[PDB]
Amino acid sequence: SMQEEDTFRELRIFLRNVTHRLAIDKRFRVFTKPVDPDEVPDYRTVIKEPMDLSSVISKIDLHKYLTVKDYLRDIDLICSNALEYNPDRDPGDRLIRHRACALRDTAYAIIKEELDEDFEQLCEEIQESR
Ligand SMILES: O=C(C1CCC1)N1C[C@@H]2C[C@@H](CO)O[C@]2(CCO)C1
């Protein structure tokens, strides 16, 4: 229905606003573009599903997300990829891991304060009807 298409258009507006707020934070600059495959050749040998905030913006616009749950699966992938590629004790790996955990915790905190639980349940029920 047009009412359902209006629901999904409000979800995309909400997701673009959250993603922009993460992408302008100086801590998260390292998550704004893909890891460069010419400059980091063993990256895509280890990480089988690369993800970053520019790719997330593209996915919102391609109508890939019907729920905030499916958006948070990609934010969790950005965080898990950084934890698995950079696992060592040295300061450069520890700084990446701390920033990845802060990106995930920040996204979940914005969603807890600003997403209505009944709006999310509506998106889940339209998705499950298709
Ligand atoms: O995993 C990441 C992203 C940082 C936030 C996720 N890498 C892995 C490469 C090795 C690591 C050396 O410190 O830096 C990277 C290359 C420079 O950008 C980026």
Q: Which domain holds residue 44?
A: 1-130
Q: Which residue minimizes the CA distance to atom 5 of ligand 1?
A: 30
Ligand 1 contact, 79 CB (< 6 A):
no
Indicate the burial class of 107 (C-beta count within 10 angstroms; 0-12, 13-18, 19 or more). Answer: buried
CB of 28 sitting under 6 A from ligand 1: no
Tokens describing residue 91: 């300061």
Number of domains in the chain: 1
State the Cα–Cα distance between residues 119 and 67, nearest whole angstrom: 9
* CATH code (residue 65): 1.20.920.10
Does the beta carbon of 66 sit less than 6 angstroms from any atom of ligand 1? no
Q: Which technique was the structure solved with, according to the deposited record?
A: X-ray
Measured from the Cα of 78, ligand 1's closest atom is 6
Tell me the structure's resolution in angstroms, rounded to a single decimal.
Answer: 1.6
The CA 23 to ligand 1 mean position distance, Å, reads 16
Contacts of 106 (CB under 8 A, 6+ apart): 22, 25
Q: Is 51 helix (H, G, I), strand (E, B) or coil?
A: coil
> What is the Cα gyration radius of the chain?
16
